[model samples]
Every structure is written in structure tokens, then in C-alpha cells.
Target: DKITVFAAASLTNALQDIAVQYKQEKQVDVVASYASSSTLARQIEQGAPADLFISADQQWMDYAIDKQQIVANTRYTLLGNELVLIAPQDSQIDKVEIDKKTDWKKLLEGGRLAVGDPDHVPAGIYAKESLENLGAWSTLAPEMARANNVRSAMALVERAEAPLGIVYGSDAVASKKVKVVGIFPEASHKPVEYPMAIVKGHDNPTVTAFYDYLKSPAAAVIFKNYGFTPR
Candidate 1:
């Protein structure tokens, strides 16, 4: 049988590798769906056949629990991440300091900054918060090119569609086409957290077993290698 998991788009590579390991060790197929946490939560609420869910932020997990789509007790914070500023690898720009004094216009070079849609995507939400707290929001807001998710935002910078992008540190590490130029100060926004849980009615022994495996030490190693701080 297959276990279906709805996870945040930022978790794409890590989860895929873990799923393959799980399949080889346990002989159980694992299917994963990756998207913005808000989208995944709404899908779960609409009866998506997901046995488990891993959201990139607390709000979306709270939403799923409130909708009675998740088994509350199974929910736990799983990982932490850092937000970063990235530019295409070929760009001449190097290390940058992101703060109240950052010159958005100079850095962007007359192009827009790419980021996930701050209205819903977790990475974007964090990006907006950090920028606002650091005094860069007002000047950069109108000059933004928002993508549906963090990965897409990174893609924009990777393809040079935008001069710069704000994405998770893990994302910056995942893409060879981009380079991290600066990291958002942790005090500038809420800590990036990942919360995971099993779907309400799908909490059978099979799902429970896989959930345990995910929280196991072996899985933690994989997550760490992918740049996540296992929680």
C-alpha cells in the first residue's frame, strides 16, 4: 500500500530522498505532494487523500487541525530553516549585508526582487516579515516579483528573470544555479519552523509506522544534510 504525504514545497528534495529510503527499507510506497503550506492545508480540508502533512509554518498546521483534518496529538515541530538572499551564480554580486541600510535599488540593478507570494507562502511570509523589520519592505514591496512558492521564486533568480530573490537557506543550497549573498537576521522575523502530523482518519498502523520513521535519527541525518535543523 502507498502512504500519501502533503508537504511544503521547500521540503521537496529532502522528502523525496527520505521517501526512497523508506521504500527500500520498509517496502512501502510513499507518495508526496509538495506545494505552499496554505494550499496543502486547504487541500487536506477539501478531503485530499493525504495520510500525513508537513507544513513549513505553524499557521497552516493550525489551520488543518482547526478544520479537523489532522490528528492533533500527532503534530510536532520538526525542523528549522534560515531565510537568505540569493542571486544567479553568474552574477558579479557577492556578499551583501541585508539590513535597514541595504540599498534595494542598487542591488536590484533596476530589476525586481523575486520572492514567494507573501500573502500565503510561508517563505514569503517570513521574507516579508524580515524585510519589514529590517526597514527594507517599503522600498522593495512595489519592486517585487512574487512567485507561487519558494522554489519558483528561486527559479526566477536562477533564470535571471529577477536580479535577486529571497528564499530559504535550504533552497539556496539545493540549487547550483544560485548563490547565497546574505542571510536575514534571525531577530528580524519569527523562526522558520516545520510542523508535521498525521491526517485524522488515516492514522492506521501503516501511517503511524512511517511517521515514527520520519522522526527517527536516520531521517534526522538526511534532513540535516539538506540544511534543515531537525527539531
Candidate 2:
């Protein structure tokens, strides 16, 4: 039987590679669904029939564990990410003085600033907090162009629909049309931690095996290649 896993959208590429390796080793199919942690959690609550859940943040993991949807003891923080401010690849905006000068904020005030929807995507929550910490939230709030997810936010900037955007460092690195301008200091918002766990109602042996494979050193290497730090 296949082991179903719900994972964060940002983990799409890396996790797919890991799943391939896992299938070869265990000879069991691994099916993954990617979405924001909140969306995935809602699906789990609605009886999504998943064997594992990988959340972009600990809060959703705690929620699932609290509701008995995931094994509390099996929960583990797996990876960490850095938030970044981005612009088009050919942008004239200089990043060196981004924080020192008000140019970035001025651009935001004159143009759209793309970001994920804060209510669902963890990246957006981090971006929102970072803007507030930098004291630019109120000035740039009206310029915000809310995307459904972090990838969409990148898309908006890549298409030049927005002059500026906030996204994960990995996403910025993956896109050729965009460039990262600056990294949000860790102190600006809560740490970005990805947590993984086995879903509570799964009795399949392959599900357990896949859970172990996700923690293997090989999996850690794949995640690190995508700009994630092992947790």
C-alpha cells in the first residue's frame, strides 16, 4: 500500500527526490500532497487519510498532535529556512543600502509589493513580521499584493507585476527571473522551522519506514542543497 504524506509546498522539489529514493529502497509507493501547513492541517482535520504530515511550522504540528491526529513523540523539527526580500533580476535597486536608505520602501510605496497570504502561508507570516520590525509595514501595507502562496509571490515579481516581493531564500535561488535583495534578520520574526511526523491512525509498516527515511542523512543532504539547515 502507498504511504500518503502531506508536506509544505516549498519542499516540493527536494521531497520528490527523497520520495524517489525511498521508493527504490522500500519498494513502496510514496504519495505526497503539497500545500501550506494550515491548509494541510485543515485537510488532515477533514480526514484526508494521510500517513504522514510535514508542516512548515511547529504551531500546526502542535495543533495536529494536540488533536491526536499525529503521534506526539514522533514529531521532529527537520529543517530551517531564511526569509528574503526580492526583486527582478535586472532591477536597478541596490541592496547594499536597502536598510540604510529608504529606497526599497519608496519603491514599495510607488509599486506593488508581493507577498504570500499571511493567514495561511508561513512565509507570508514571516514577511509580515519582518516588515513590521523594520517599521515599514504601515508605509507599505497598502502596496501589498497578496499571493495565494510564496511561490505565487515570486511569480508576481518574476513577471514584473510587482516591483518587490518577499520569499524564502531557496525560492529566490531557484528563480532565474528574480534576485534576492536582502535577508530578513532572524530577530525580525519567529524562526522558520519545518516539522515532520507520522500521522496517528496509520498502521502501515511502509509508513513507518518512510518516516525513518525522511530522517536519514541522505535526506538531510538533499534538504541542505535547497538552502535548508538541518534541524
Candidate 3:
């Protein structure tokens, strides 16, 4: 049987790895679509052929619940990740203290800061919250390079297109071209949470079987290896 899993882009590496092993063990093909949670959730609402949904934050999942796009009872918080600021590996600028008094504009050295679109993408939303709490959003917003998703935001830093970017800690770990310079404090924003659920009208035996496997210890291990804290 085949299963389609629509997950946040940040979960790409871990889920891809899990899908391989799962195929070997269960003889089921696990296909995944990775994008901003907002994009994925909206797609499901429009009748995308997705069997499972995993969002990077509660807001999008709540959106899905409101749209009746997912099986609410099957939803569960599955992971937590850290928000961090990163720069290209060879950049001379090192870590900067992050707080309400931080001179983020000075840190950019006249370059743009890359981030997911704060209006919808979860990582961007978290980034905006932390920056706002740090009292830097207003000044930084003008120089921001808003990307479609967190991974693309990280890519801007990796490619040195933007001197720095805000992304998940796991994203920095996943890339060799960038280095994390500072982590956003936990209190700076809402906790980074990943929630998963089966798609509505598609919770058949095949979907349930794979959904159960996704939450199993085996999948948890893969998530941890990718710097995510499995719940």
C-alpha cells in the first residue's frame, strides 16, 4: 500500500529517513510532501490527496481542525524544536547577545536578514514573535528577506545571499554551510511544537497503520537524530 504524508519542511530530513526504513520493514511506500505548514494545511483543505498531516505549529493545525480537513481525534503533539539565528560558515561575525536591547540592525552590517514569511510560515511566526519580544522586529522588518519556508530562509544564509537568517536549530544542524550564532530564548515566543493527525475521510486501515508507525519508537529515534525533541 502507499501512504502520503504532508509535513512541515523542517521535518524533511528525518521523515525521509524514516520513510526508507519503514518501507523496508512494512513493505509500504511512504510518500511525503514537505512545505510550510500553512501551505500544506491549505492544500489539504482544498482536497489534496494527503493521508496524513503534520504541522510545525498549533495555529495551522487548529486551522485544519476548523476547516474539518483532519481527523481531530488522531492529532497529537509530536515534537519540539529550538529557534536560532545563523550565518554563513565563513562569516567573520560571530555570536551576538539576543535580548530586548540587541542592536540587530548593527549585526546585519547593512545586509538583509532572511526568514520565513511571518504571516503564515510557522518558523517565521516564531521568529517574528521572538524578534518582537526582543524589541527588534520594527527595525529589522524593513531589511528582511522573507522566504516561503524555513529551509529556504536557511538557504539564504547558506548561500550568503543574506548575511544571517532565523530558522530552527535543527535546520542549522542539518546544513554544513551555515553555523548557528545564537538561539532565541524559550520565553521569547510560543513553544515550537509539531502536531500530527490523519486526514479526514482517509483514516482507513492503511493510513492508521502508517500513522501508528510514525509515532512509534523507531520513528522517534530518527527524529531525535535530526535534532528534534520527540514527544
Candidate 4:
């Protein structure tokens, strides 16, 4: 039988590859639905039929566990990612200095700056914290064009709707439409961690097998290839 997995949008490419490999090895279908963790959580709360859930951060996983939607013992950290500042491939914002005072506010005037909406998206929350730590948040606040998720935020920059944006390191690596300007110093924000777990009520054997497969060396290599460090 096939296993349905709900995962973070950023994991789409990497997990899709894993799904193919899993199918080849186990002869079981793996279907993945990718979205922001917050949005996925809402679906799970409303009884979406998912066998497993992989979140971009621990908070959403914890939320699922609190709702009795996930198997507590199956919850585990899977990978780590870094945040970066990105710009349109041909944009003029070559570099951003965290230490040197620059007029980023003025630079964003007329030109848009993309970010996930901090209220619901983990990437945006991290970006907001990084900006605040760099003393740029207050100044850049008004310049932000908030998107529903990191992928959409990157899309805004890719379409030239925004001159600059912030997204995960893996996302920047996956997209050819953008250029990574700089990585926000780790000191600026909380560590980015991805966690995965089996859903409590899902009794699918394929789901259990896929969960174990995620911890295998093959999956670890795939994750590393996609710019994520196994946790």
C-alpha cells in the first residue's frame, strides 16, 4: 500500500528523490504533499489523511504531538539548514554587510523586498530575527513584501517583483532564478532544524518503513547533497 506523507515545502526536491528510491527498494508507493509546517498542521488538525509528517522546525512537530496526531516516540530531528539573503539573478544588491551600516531601507524603496510573513511562516520568523539582530529590522520593516511561505517569497524575487529576498540556503541552491548574496550569521537567529515523525493513527507499514529509511545512509547522503546537514 502507498504511504501519504505531509512535509515542509522546502523538502520537496530532496524528499521526492527519496520517495523514488524508497519505491524502488520496497515496492511501496510514497506520496508527498508539501506545504509550510503551519499550514500542514492546520490540515492535520482537521484530520487530513497523512501517514507521516516532516516539519521544517520542531515547533510544528511538537504541535502535532500535543494534538495527539503524531506518535511521540517516533518524533526525531532529521536535518539542519542555514538561512541566506537572496537577490534576483541580475540584481544590483551584490552584498549585504551585517557589521557595516548600509542604507538597506533606502535601497528597498520603490524596489520590493520579499520575505515570508513572520506570523505564520518559520522562515520569515527566522529572517525577522536575523534582521533584528543586525539592527536592520526596524528600518527595513516597511519595505517588506510578505509572502505566505518561503517558496513564494523566493518566487517573488525570481519574477523580479522584488529586488531582494531572504530564504533558506537549500532553497537558494535549488533555484536558478536567484543569487545568494550572503548567509546570515548563525549568531543572528535560532538554529534551523527539521524534524520528522509518524502520525499516531496511521497504521500503514509503508509509513513505518519510509520513516526508518529516512534515517538510512542513502537518505543522509541525499540530504547532504541538497545542502542539509543530518542532525
Candidate 5:
């Protein structure tokens, strides 16, 4: 049986790499769908055939639990990440200092700041918290370009569609087209987390095997290579 995972968009590269290795070594196909965690959770509630769920934040997993869409017993926090400020790799500006108050606001003047939607996406929530705590939220709110997910926000930086963007550290490195200019202080927001769980009624042997592999050393290295801290 195939193992299908609905994961946060930030996990795109890391999970894809792990899935490739799993396919090569276990002779099984591990398919993945990546998007905003809330989107994935809503889709699962509407009957998406995903055997596993990995949300970028705990809230969406709680949504799944509230909807009775996931097996409560299988859920656990899986990984952690850092928030960052990024720019197009080719950007002329090289660096910015991050603190309770930052000068990044002036650097991207007349350009939009990209971030995931603060209403639902975890990255956006973290970005909002960071900005609020940083004394930039009120001044920058009108200049924001909200995306559906963190990867989309990262893509905005990569394509130079947004002069500056906030995303996960892993996302900043995922595309050579983007470069991290600054990292948000840990105190700026709640810690970034990705939680995983099996969907209800699909706790079969193959799914468990793949889940075990995800917690194994090989997957840990893949996650670390992508800049994620395995839990």
C-alpha cells in the first residue's frame, strides 16, 4: 500500500528527499501533498485520502482533532524551525540587523513585504508575532503581501516579486534564488513547530512503517540538511 502525507509547504524539499530514499530503499511509493497546514487540514476534513498529516503548527493539528479527522493517539510534534528575513539572492542590499526594533522597514521601501496569511498559516502567525514584538507591525501592515503558505512567501522573495519577505530558515535556503538577511530572535514569537499524526481509519502496517522511517536517523539527516531541527 502507498503512504500518502499531507505536509506543510515548508517541508517540501526535505520530505521529498526522504520520500525518494524511502522509495529506493523500501520499494514503496510515499506520495506527498504540500500546502498551507490549514488548507491541508480542511481538505482532509472534506475527505482527502491522506494517510498522514504534518502541520507546520499545532493549531491546525488541533483543528484536525476537533473535526475527528485524525487518529488522536498517533499525533506528536515532529520538528522545529526558525523565522527569518530574506531577499532575492540578487538583491543589492546585503544585510540587516534584527532586534526588538529593526531597520529592515526602510530597506524595502515602495515594495511589498511578503508573508503567509496571518489568519491561518503558521509562518504568517509567527511573522505577525515577530513583527508585532519588533515594533514594525503597525507601520508595515499596509505594505504586506499575504500568501497562502510559507513557501509561497519564499517564492515571492526568490522571484523578486516582493522586495523582502519573512519565511522559515529552511525555506530561505531551499531556493538558491533567495538569501536570508536576518534571523528573528527566538523571543520574537512562539517557537516554530511541525506536528505529525496518522489520519483516522488508515493506521495500517505500511503507513506505520513509513512513519517509523520518518523518525529514523536517515530522515533526521535529511531534515537537518534542510535546516530543520528534528524533535
Candidate 6:
């Protein structure tokens, strides 16, 4: 039987690599689903077969626990992240100053800003918070092209569909088509956190075992190489 892990899309590469290595070393077929955390949480609440659940933020984990989908006692905050402003790799503008004085609406010059949907996507929620705290929300909100997840937001900038994008630092660096121009001030938004837990109904040893491996020294190396701060 497969061990299923439903994780936030921001963990795409790092988590995939870790899963592949885990299958080889332990002979347990580990399957993963990556998407916006809210989407995953809702799916789990709707009866998605998941052994483990990992969210990009605490909000979705709280949602899952509230829905009785996750075992709250098994949850732990696993990582931290930084949000960044990015541009296409070939764009001429080299840097952006993210501050209250910055006119974010003018930076795009009529082009759209790509971001995840602030209604539920953690990246989008953080992006909205940061921009609002920076004093640009009133003008910049209308300029956004919202995506379903952080990776998709980065994809918009990569394809030049949007002149600028808000994404996690890891997502920006993981793509060759995008370059980080500004690191949002730490105080601009809530800290980016990853919370993980075992699904409430899963009693299999394989599920618990893989969950443990994710917190092990080997998985930490992959996560750090991908630019996430191990929590």
C-alpha cells in the first residue's frame, strides 16, 4: 500500500526528492499530492486518503483540525520561509525597494502583479499583508493576477504574463525563469511557517514512519538546500 502525503505546493521539489529517496531506502511507496494548502485541507476534510498533511501556514492546519481531518497532537511546525518580490529573469529592473514610500502600483506600469489568491492561499495572504503593511494595498490590490498557489504565481512571472510576482524565497530561487528583486521586510507580514501532521484516521506504521523520516537529518538537508529555514 502507498503512504500518501498531501503537502503544500511550495514544497514541490524538495518534498518530491525526499519522497523518492525514502521509497528507495525503506521500500514504502510514498505518494504525494501538492497544491494550495487550503485546497489540500479541504480535500482532506472531504475524505481524501492521506497519511500525512503538510501546510504552508498554520491557518490551513487549523482548518483541518477543526474539520477533524488531522490529529492535532501529532502536528508540529516544521519550517519557516521568506516572501520575495520577483521579476522575469531577463527583465532590466535589477532591484526593488520594498518600503512604505515605494509606489508598488507604479512599478508595474500597467502590467499585473502575480500572486496567489489572498482569500485562502497562504502565499497570497502573506503577500496581501505585506503590501497592506507597506501602505500600498489600496492601489496595488486591483493590479494583481491571482493564482491558486505560490508556484503558479511564480509561473506567471516566469511566462511574463505578469511583470512582477510575490512568492516564497524558495519558490523564486528554485525557478531559473525568475529572479528575486526584493526580500519583503520581516515585519511586513506574519512569518511564513510550515505545519505538518498525521491524518486522524491513519494508523499504519508506514504513515507514522515516513512522517518521522521527514523530520530526520536527511530530510533537513534537502529542505535547507531548497532555502527553507528548518524550524
Query: Which predicted model would earn the best TM-score?
Result: 1
Worst 10 residues of 3 by lDDT: 96-105
TM-score of each: 0.87, 0.86, 0.85, 0.85, 0.85, 0.85
| lDDT to native, each model | 0.91, 0.83, 0.90, 0.86, 0.88, 0.89
Q: What is the per-residue lDDT of model 3 for residues 1-231, given as tens digits with 9 covering 90 to 100?
A: 899999998798999999999999989999999988889999999999999999988989999999988899999999999998999999987887788878887889999999999997677988999988888889888999999877788888999989999988888889999998888999999998999999999989988988888888999999999889888
Model 1's C-alpha root-mean-square deviation from the true structure amounts to: 2.3
Residue range 68-168, candidate 6, lDDT tens digits: 88888989898899999999999876799899998776789899999999997777888999988888888887889989867788889999989999988
Model 2, 1-231: lDDT tens per residue?
688889988888888989898878777888899987888988898888998999988998888888788877888898888888899988886483335345565666478989998776667888888878877778777788988977788999999889888888878877889998887887778898889988887846777778888888989898887777777
Off by over 4 Å in 1: none
Summed backbone clashes in each candidate are: 0, 0, 0, 0, 0, 0
Once model 2 is optimally superposed onto the true structure by TM-score, how far is the C-alpha of residue 165 displaced, in angstroms? 0.7
lDDT-sorted candidate list, best first:
1, 3, 6, 5, 4, 2
lDDT of 5 by residue, 25-108 (tens): 999999999988889999999999999999988989999999999999999888988898889998987788888657656788
The 10 consecutive residues of candidate 5 with the worst lDDT sum are 100-109
Worst-scoring 10-residue span by lDDT in model 4: 98-107
| Residue 118, candidate 3: alpha-carbon lDDT | 99
CA RMSD of all predictions:
2.3, 2.5, 2.5, 2.6, 2.6, 2.6
Residue ranges of candidate 6 with Cα displaced over 4 Å: 103-106, 117-121, 146-152
lDDT of 4: 0.86
For model 6, the run of ten residues with the poorest summed lDDT: 203-212
